[PDB]
Amino acid sequence: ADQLTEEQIAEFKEAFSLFDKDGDGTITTKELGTVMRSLGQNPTEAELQDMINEVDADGNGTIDFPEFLTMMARKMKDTDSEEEIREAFRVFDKDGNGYISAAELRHVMTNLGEKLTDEEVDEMIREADIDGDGQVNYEEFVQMMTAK
């Protein structure tokens, strides 16, 4: 209700510090989209008006960080619990073949920020890979979301 997983801890710190330069406690509204996009996220302006509409319910002109991911937790938790996983293929699965290959995770990484060669990927996959085909499936990419 108040906190989720380290997922919040990973970006609620940056979504806070990426734009809290004014020293206004939390990050600005007109800039929240950018604190959101500076994270690699590509949201809508209309939803940016939907969230600014939801947060500006107090009238402070700023955006709390521990309570916004919670908004993201509810944007996925109640909508579809089945598609919530398959969307990760929307995240990593590039070749749309069902298997997020080592080039795609690399191409993921490149999109996300890192470049990863052929021999450096044979660790990102093996980490989730059960059979070791070199192309991460659902259950490998999935178990690693629970494995720990």
Binding site: T5, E6, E7, A10, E11, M36, G40, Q41, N42, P43, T44, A46, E47, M72, K75, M76, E83, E84, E87, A88, R90, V91, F92, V108, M109, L112, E123, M124, I125, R126, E127, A128, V136, E140, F141, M144, M145, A147, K148
Partner: peptide
């Protein structure tokens, strides 16, 4: 890290369609 790598990358990008609208 050698045996754990997606576990680290997932925390950053585990969900995208949650805040995405197309």
């Amino acid at each position: 890290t050698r045996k754990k790598t997606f576990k680290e990358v997932a925390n950053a990008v585990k969900i995208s369609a949650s805040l995405m609208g197309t």
